[PDB]
Each structure stands twice: as structure tokens, then as C-alpha cells.
């Protein structure tokens, strides 16, 4: 159901987040909450964005 009147803000509600990168798809009902920095090339991230 719709949540506008309950989750929208004029200044912008920025609390809701979604995962975007991963080497493989999640299996059914499998939960990933990892926050490790995603490395796109050969350069290591070392936890720095």
C-alpha cells in the first residue's frame, strides 16, 4: 500500500536505503546486510569511498 502521507518529506527523506552492488544474486529469503565498500577496479578500497 501507499506510504506518501507517512514517509515523504519536503526537505527529502533520506533514511530509506537499498543495496545496489553484489557479485551474485541473493538466494530466496537470503539476507545480506554487509556494508563493505565495493571495489570496481584493481585499486583496493581499504574502506575509503
Amino acid at each position: 500500500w501507499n506510504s506518501n502521507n507517512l514517509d515523504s518529506k519536503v526537505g527529502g527523506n533520506y533514511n530509506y536505503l537499498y543495496r545496489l552492488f553484489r557479485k551474485s544474486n541473493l538466494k530466496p529469503f537470503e539476507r545480506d546486510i554487509s556494508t563493505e565498500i565495493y571495489q570496481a577496479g584493481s585499486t583496493p578500497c581499504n574502506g575509503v569511498e
Epitope: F21, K23, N25, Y38, Q39, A40, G41
Partner: antibody, heavy 117, light 108 residues
């Protein structure tokens, strides 16, 4: 700096087939979103397809049953394959990495493809 | 799909001035738009995203704005290389698409 070497392109007759490809100088194609866009003079530009980092596929309705995308990890090379073109498809196709909500960040120089008997 | 509209069909400004570009769409985008630059015989380059998020490699002269299917880009102190066609890119649905394009010309 960041470079993508392209390959393929050329003439094909209708009813034929062709495999196109492009490679990465430094970037990990296996670990980022990849997409094709085809650009034609006088007709405009369009979005084609994409592979998500999980390997999932997704197309535009205009090439279903006629286009297919994939990715070879053995050579870090993106690939592209063609079935039964149309004269309208006459265009220059490009390889480019996008991230997340589809900023088309880095681009190759593009390679033309021509169809005719 | 959702269609975008670009105005003007042609824009020509002299150097050192400030050029303005506006884009319109049938259905809203909620400030997810983006601008790309492509010189002839060159690959397109990313410029700015959403309302005002400029790209890394672009100078401060570039600035866009907008919301609710009406969106505007303004560039100050025009420089000779800035001649190109420009493109706005859609975010509202799958499939994506992007508009016809705009060509900007310099008068010296």
C-alpha cells in the same frame, strides 16, 4: 585514463548473424553494470540492453528474440550477438559502463554496423 | 514509455555569456534527470545528474535545476570548446530513453 577498446562492426546481409564485443583497459567488467546503446544519424539514439552485476539480463522490446547480451570472464570482454536485423537498425553501437541509477559514466568511441544485401 | 521534450530546437550564444537549456517530459521524473555532452566524432561525456549534481570532471560553469517534469540547465561564461549537442536522460521507468537533443553554437 580509463579506456575501453571496441571491436566488431562491419557489413552484414539481412537474415545473417554477427558477434560484436568490446574490452576493458583497467575496469572490472564482471563486477559492474554494462549496457549497449545504438546511435543512428537522422533517427536519434536509443537504449538497447544491460547486464546487471549479478549476471541478470534485461532488454528493450525492440530487439527481443533478435538480440542477446553476455559477458566472458575468461577474457574480461563484453560480448554481443545479432539475429535477423532490420534496415532501421542501421546505426552505430556503443559500449559504456553505467552505475546504479544509470549515469552512463564512461564510454567507448563507438563502432558502426551496416546491414544490406 | 515516457517522452521528453527539449527547447530550444536551436540555441546560439556568443562567448562569455550565459546559456540556458530547459527540458520537459510527459510524466514526472522527480529530479532524476541528467545531462550528457557529445562533440562530433567523439564519445558522449557525463555532465550533471538530477537537479544539480554536477559530474566530477566538469567545471563550475555548468549548473542545472528543475523539478516536476520541468527542468532547466544554465551554463555561465561560455567558452569556445563548449560547442556540442546536449542530451537529457530519463529515469522514470523501464525502458529508459532520452530526448532528441539540442545543438548549441557560438557566434564570434
Amino acid at each position: 585514463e580509463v579506456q575501453l577498446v571496441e571491436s566488431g562492426g562491419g557489413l552484414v546481409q539481412p537474415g545473417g548473424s554477427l558477434r560484436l564485443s568490446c574490452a576493458a583497459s583497467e575496469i572490472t567488467v564482471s563486477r559492474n553494470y554494462m549496457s549497449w546503446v545504438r546511435q543512428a544519424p537522422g533517427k536519434g539514439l536509443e537504449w538497447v540492453s544491460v547486464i546487471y552485476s549479478g549476471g541478470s539480463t534485461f532488454y528493450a522490446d525492440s530487439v527481443k528474440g533478435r538480440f542477446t547480451i553476455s559477458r566472458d570472464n575468461s577474457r574480461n570482454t563484453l560480448y554481443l550477438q545479432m539475429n535477423s536485423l532490420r534496415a532501421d537498425d542501421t546505426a552505430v553501437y556503443y559500449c559504456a559502463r553505467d552505475y546504479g541509477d544509470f549515469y552512463f559514466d564512461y564510454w567507448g568511441q563507438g563502432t558502426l554496423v551496416t546491414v544490406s544485401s | 514509455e515516457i517522452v521528453l521534450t527539449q527547447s530550444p530546437g536551436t540555441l546560439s550564444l556568443s562567448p562569455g555569456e550565459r546559456a540556458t537549456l530547459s527540458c520537459r517530459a510527459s510524466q514526472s521524473i522527480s529530479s532524476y534527470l541528467a545531462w550528457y555532452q557529445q562533440k562530433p566524432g567523439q564519445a558522449p561525456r557525463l555532465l550533471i545528474y538530477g537537479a544539480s549534481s554536477r559530474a566530477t570532471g566538469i567545471p563550475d560553469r555548468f549548473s542545472g535545476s528543475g523539478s516536476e517534469t520541468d527542468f532547466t540547465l544554465t551554463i555561465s561564461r561560455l567558452e569556445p570548446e563548449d560547442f556540442a549537442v546536449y542530451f537529457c536522460q530519463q529515469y522514470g521507468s523501464s525502458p529508459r530513453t532520452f530526448g532528441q537533443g539540442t545543438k548549441l553554437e557560438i557566434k564570434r
